[PDB]
Amino acid sequence: QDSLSFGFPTFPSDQKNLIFQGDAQIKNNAVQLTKTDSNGNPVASTVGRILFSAQVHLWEKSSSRVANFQSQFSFSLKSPLSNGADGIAFFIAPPDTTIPSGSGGGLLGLFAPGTAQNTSANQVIAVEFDTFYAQDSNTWDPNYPHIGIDVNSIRSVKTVKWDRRDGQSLNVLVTFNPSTRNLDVVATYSDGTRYEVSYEVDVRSVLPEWVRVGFSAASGEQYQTHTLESWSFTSTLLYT
Amino acid sequence: QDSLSFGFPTFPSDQKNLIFQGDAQIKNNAVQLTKTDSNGNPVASTVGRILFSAQVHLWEKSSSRVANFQSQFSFSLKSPLSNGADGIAFFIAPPDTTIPSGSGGGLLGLFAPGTAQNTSANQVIAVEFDTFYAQDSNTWDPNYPHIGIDVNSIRSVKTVKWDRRDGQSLNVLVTFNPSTRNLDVVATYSDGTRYEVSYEVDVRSVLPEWVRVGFSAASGEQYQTHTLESWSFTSTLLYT
Ligand SMILES: OC[C@H]1O[C@H](OC[C@H]2O[C@H](OC[C@H]3O[C@@H](O)[C@@H](O)[C@@H](O)[C@@H]3O)[C@@H](O)[C@@H](O[C@H]3O[C@H](CO)[C@@H](O)[C@H](O)[C@@H]3O)[C@@H]2O)[C@@H](O)[C@@H](O)[C@@H]1O
Ligand SMILES: OC[C@H]1O[C@H](O[C@@H]2[C@H](O)[C@@H](O)O[C@H](CO)[C@H]2O)[C@@H](O)[C@@H](O)[C@@H]1O
Ligand SMILES: [Ca+2]
Ligand SMILES: [Ca+2]
Ligand SMILES: [Mn+2]
Ligand SMILES: [Mn+2]
């Protein structure tokens, strides 16, 4: 299909079109990407991702069209620790994408250690909300919590300072305009606090024609829950 | 998802979200539900169906919601003969549906011979465009070409006389309103000739909460091509 759209105002337990990878699962009408104990508290060493089952037609070589897409979603992070880790990310990757071996912790379940910073060995575009930046382990991160745009590497092509707020929902709107090739990110907390970051990228040189979209999260030594509360997505092929 | 929609203005050969069953295949940017020879001519004894991969949430017992839906599509029938058979149908059925054994010809690839008219034995709602009605083999049919609404039986609960036009595209709009429970069908040819038929049906008592939608077509001893040219679908769960 040239156009596809779906909306999850909430996430009931009875799901049919989501691919669950790792420790991800539904709990209390929301997706808990990372593992939580019986009391619902976050635990260390956990990675989880979800993908919508239907494949998205991102671009089409034969007709030189590229999709205009928008992803709106909200999530919340919570942890009794002063340094909850590691973060959640919305991503786009080839349809057969699975959790790489050893992609836990700061790698957000998106990259393998050996090529995490090798832009030539990956095919992934992601928007990360990174809460852990210890300069000794996450050497690639700026020294503060941030929102980052990742293109084939855990070392963001761009970051903006972000404030982590325990237990508060962050609403995010990610859009891509094929005409300008601008990938825009707008995130807001309920009090009006706003964050914006943009980056020009030709998705055709990074991703295959058909892709799957979803979210990924992970916790290494430090932990926190990564709760996806809602998600709506839409994409349509346009001439360029 | 509470809402889902997709649109196929045409059907390029590289499909990823379509389930092909029987002889259905893509040819010349359209879906040929029934088999054709080398020079594109229709052949006898052929059945084919397509279903969209993502499951549709038709209703939810938890929230007492029922989905409203709208399916828009166009098809054309072509046959060297003048008694083309057997017809094409838009249908909704359980996710694991497959072509029943012996459902060729007048059964349109939707029902088994032994239970074709047993309502309590089937789970399917379909909108058929039936072009063959010989009373010896299609005993359940009115004695003329017709559009019919089928609810768990090949013997339509409601039909309207229809005119078959070789090679001309028929535009169809099928809508289901959960508030009134009316399933409305509107079909028109490019010159404005219009056909309408509707029926009141409580989908909750006929189909499970999650379903799959698609098309089916078949040709017995008489034949014609069943070319699906375009298709768009949208459904949204609503409180009545
Ligand atoms: O989930 C977070 C993080 O977890 C993993 O990283 C492990 C660990 O790496 C560094 O410390 C290594 C080692 O140091 C020893 O002295 C001892 O403490 C041992 O237990 C540690 O494993 C640090 O980056 C560490 O972070 C903590 O210490 C730093 C100071 O060095 C603080 O700034 C920070 O706030 C923490 O208190 C970290 O836990 C990996 O999975 C990694 O990918 C993850 O991002
Ligand atoms: O495709 C039409 C029709 O073919 C088969 O039945 C035949 C027709 O009724 C007609 O050709 O007369 C034949 C002799 O009686 C009869 O076999 C079946 O496949 C039927 O299902 C189909 O509608
Ligand atoms: Ca980090
Ligand atoms: Ca018939
Ligand atoms: Mn980062
Ligand atoms: Mn009929």
Side-chain angles (χ1 to χ4, degrees), chain A residues 37 45 56 80 82 103 109 113 121 128 140 148 159 167 176-177 238-239:
Chain A
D37 58 46
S45 299
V56 179
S82 60
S103 58
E128 50 162 76
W140 56 78
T159 67
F176 177 68
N177 185 318
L238 288 55
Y239 288 113

mmCIF file of all heavy atoms in Angstrom, chain A residues 37 45 56 80 82 103 109 113 121 128 140 148 159 167 176-177 238-239:
data_model
loop_
_atom_site.group_PDB
_atom_site.id
_atom_site.type_symbol
_atom_site.label_atom_id
_atom_site.label_comp_id
_atom_site.label_asym_id
_atom_site.label_seq_id
_atom_site.Cartn_x
_atom_site.Cartn_y
_atom_site.Cartn_z
ATOM 1 N N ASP A 37 9.708 -6.423 37.888
ATOM 2 C CA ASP A 37 9.384 -7.538 38.771
ATOM 3 C C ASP A 37 7.891 -7.594 39.071
ATOM 4 O O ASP A 37 7.100 -6.831 38.511
ATOM 5 C CB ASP A 37 10.170 -7.458 40.091
ATOM 6 C CG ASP A 37 9.919 -6.168 40.853
ATOM 7 O OD1 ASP A 37 8.749 -5.757 40.983
ATOM 8 O OD2 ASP A 37 10.900 -5.574 41.348
ATOM 9 N N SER A 45 19.757 -5.241 33.527
ATOM 10 C CA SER A 45 19.982 -6.181 32.430
ATOM 11 C C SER A 45 18.736 -6.634 31.693
ATOM 12 O O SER A 45 18.389 -7.818 31.708
ATOM 13 C CB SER A 45 20.726 -7.415 32.945
ATOM 14 O OG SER A 45 21.987 -7.043 33.463
ATOM 15 N N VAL A 56 6.081 -1.055 6.219
ATOM 16 C CA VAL A 56 5.818 0.281 5.705
ATOM 17 C C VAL A 56 6.616 0.498 4.431
ATOM 18 O O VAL A 56 7.795 0.157 4.365
ATOM 19 C CB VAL A 56 6.231 1.363 6.733
ATOM 20 C CG1 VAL A 56 5.974 2.756 6.175
ATOM 21 C CG2 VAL A 56 5.466 1.166 8.029
ATOM 22 N N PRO A 80 13.597 4.457 41.088
ATOM 23 C CA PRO A 80 13.929 4.910 42.441
ATOM 24 C C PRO A 80 15.374 5.399 42.502
ATOM 25 O O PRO A 80 15.774 6.060 43.458
ATOM 26 C CB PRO A 80 13.713 3.651 43.276
ATOM 27 C CG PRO A 80 14.181 2.578 42.328
ATOM 28 C CD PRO A 80 13.409 2.995 41.078
ATOM 29 N N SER A 82 18.817 7.525 41.289
ATOM 30 C CA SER A 82 19.065 8.907 40.893
ATOM 31 C C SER A 82 19.596 8.957 39.456
ATOM 32 O O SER A 82 19.641 10.021 38.840
ATOM 33 C CB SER A 82 20.094 9.549 41.827
ATOM 34 O OG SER A 82 21.318 8.835 41.761
ATOM 35 N N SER A 103 23.541 -5.931 22.620
ATOM 36 C CA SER A 103 23.099 -4.539 22.392
ATOM 37 C C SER A 103 22.443 -3.935 23.640
ATOM 38 O O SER A 103 21.735 -2.920 23.548
ATOM 39 C CB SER A 103 22.088 -4.493 21.251
ATOM 40 O OG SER A 103 20.981 -5.330 21.543
ATOM 41 N N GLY A 109 19.559 -1.593 22.696
ATOM 42 C CA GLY A 109 18.968 -2.714 21.990
ATOM 43 C C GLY A 109 18.916 -2.503 20.485
ATOM 44 O O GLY A 109 18.234 -3.241 19.776
ATOM 45 N N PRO A 113 27.948 -4.141 19.826
ATOM 46 C CA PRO A 113 29.163 -3.466 20.289
ATOM 47 C C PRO A 113 30.227 -3.243 19.216
ATOM 48 O O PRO A 113 30.774 -2.147 19.088
ATOM 49 C CB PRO A 113 29.648 -4.393 21.400
ATOM 50 C CG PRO A 113 28.350 -4.913 21.960
ATOM 51 C CD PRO A 113 27.677 -5.319 20.667
ATOM 52 N N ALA A 121 28.086 -0.212 8.740
ATOM 53 C CA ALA A 121 27.598 -1.550 9.077
ATOM 54 C C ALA A 121 26.159 -1.608 9.589
ATOM 55 O O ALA A 121 25.672 -2.677 9.961
ATOM 56 C CB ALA A 121 28.529 -2.189 10.108
ATOM 57 N N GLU A 128 16.354 8.867 19.901
ATOM 58 C CA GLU A 128 16.555 8.380 21.253
ATOM 59 C C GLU A 128 16.302 9.413 22.336
ATOM 60 O O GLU A 128 16.482 10.608 22.132
ATOM 61 C CB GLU A 128 17.984 7.844 21.422
ATOM 62 C CG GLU A 128 19.067 8.806 20.946
ATOM 63 C CD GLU A 128 20.445 8.478 21.512
ATOM 64 O OE1 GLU A 128 21.091 7.518 21.046
ATOM 65 O OE2 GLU A 128 20.869 9.185 22.438
ATOM 66 N N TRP A 140 30.406 7.946 23.762
ATOM 67 C CA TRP A 140 29.865 8.645 22.601
ATOM 68 C C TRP A 140 28.842 9.735 22.931
ATOM 69 O O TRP A 140 28.525 10.561 22.076
ATOM 70 C CB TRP A 140 29.232 7.613 21.677
ATOM 71 C CG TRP A 140 28.195 6.821 22.389
ATOM 72 C CD1 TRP A 140 26.923 7.213 22.683
ATOM 73 C CD2 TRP A 140 28.371 5.541 23.003
ATOM 74 N NE1 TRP A 140 26.296 6.258 23.444
ATOM 75 C CE2 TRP A 140 27.162 5.221 23.655
ATOM 76 C CE3 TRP A 140 29.435 4.634 23.065
ATOM 77 C CZ2 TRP A 140 26.986 4.029 24.362
ATOM 78 C CZ3 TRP A 140 29.259 3.447 23.772
ATOM 79 C CH2 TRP A 140 28.042 3.159 24.411
ATOM 80 N N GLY A 148 18.315 12.562 20.900
ATOM 81 C CA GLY A 148 19.260 12.489 19.804
ATOM 82 C C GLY A 148 18.709 11.806 18.575
ATOM 83 O O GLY A 148 17.815 10.962 18.660
ATOM 84 N N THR A 159 22.187 16.162 18.879
ATOM 85 C CA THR A 159 21.539 16.055 20.180
ATOM 86 C C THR A 159 21.144 17.429 20.707
ATOM 87 O O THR A 159 21.701 18.449 20.302
ATOM 88 C CB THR A 159 22.472 15.430 21.242
ATOM 89 O OG1 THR A 159 23.560 16.322 21.506
ATOM 90 C CG2 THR A 159 23.023 14.103 20.765
ATOM 91 N N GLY A 167 8.257 9.676 36.165
ATOM 92 C CA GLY A 167 6.814 9.508 36.194
ATOM 93 C C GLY A 167 5.970 10.494 35.405
ATOM 94 O O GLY A 167 4.752 10.492 35.546
ATOM 95 N N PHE A 176 8.654 13.395 8.954
ATOM 96 C CA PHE A 176 9.631 13.428 7.875
ATOM 97 C C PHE A 176 8.934 13.967 6.639
ATOM 98 O O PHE A 176 7.884 13.458 6.230
ATOM 99 C CB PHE A 176 10.192 12.036 7.561
ATOM 100 C CG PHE A 176 11.165 12.024 6.404
ATOM 101 C CD1 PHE A 176 12.408 12.643 6.514
ATOM 102 C CD2 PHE A 176 10.827 11.409 5.197
ATOM 103 C CE1 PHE A 176 13.305 12.649 5.436
ATOM 104 C CE2 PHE A 176 11.717 11.409 4.112
ATOM 105 C CZ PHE A 176 12.957 12.030 4.233
ATOM 106 N N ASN A 177 9.515 15.008 6.058
ATOM 107 C CA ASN A 177 8.969 15.624 4.862
ATOM 108 C C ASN A 177 9.936 15.274 3.728
ATOM 109 O O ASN A 177 11.079 15.734 3.719
ATOM 110 C CB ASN A 177 8.905 17.141 5.044
ATOM 111 C CG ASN A 177 8.223 17.837 3.879
ATOM 112 O OD1 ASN A 177 8.459 17.503 2.720
ATOM 113 N ND2 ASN A 177 7.389 18.825 4.183
ATOM 114 N N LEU A 238 4.801 10.060 -1.684
ATOM 115 C CA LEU A 238 4.663 11.297 -2.455
ATOM 116 C C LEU A 238 5.772 11.436 -3.499
ATOM 117 O O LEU A 238 6.882 10.932 -3.319
ATOM 118 C CB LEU A 238 4.714 12.526 -1.536
ATOM 119 C CG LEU A 238 3.555 12.878 -0.600
ATOM 120 C CD1 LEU A 238 3.222 11.714 0.302
ATOM 121 C CD2 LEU A 238 3.943 14.096 0.226
ATOM 122 N N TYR A 239 5.465 12.129 -4.591
ATOM 123 C CA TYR A 239 6.444 12.366 -5.648
ATOM 124 C C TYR A 239 7.427 13.427 -5.173
ATOM 125 O O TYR A 239 7.049 14.344 -4.446
ATOM 126 C CB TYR A 239 5.749 12.841 -6.931
ATOM 127 C CG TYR A 239 4.973 11.756 -7.644
ATOM 128 C CD1 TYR A 239 3.578 11.808 -7.734
ATOM 129 C CD2 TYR A 239 5.632 10.662 -8.208
ATOM 130 C CE1 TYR A 239 2.857 10.791 -8.367
ATOM 131 C CE2 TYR A 239 4.923 9.640 -8.842
ATOM 132 C CZ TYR A 239 3.538 9.710 -8.916
ATOM 133 O OH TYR A 239 2.836 8.690 -9.520
#
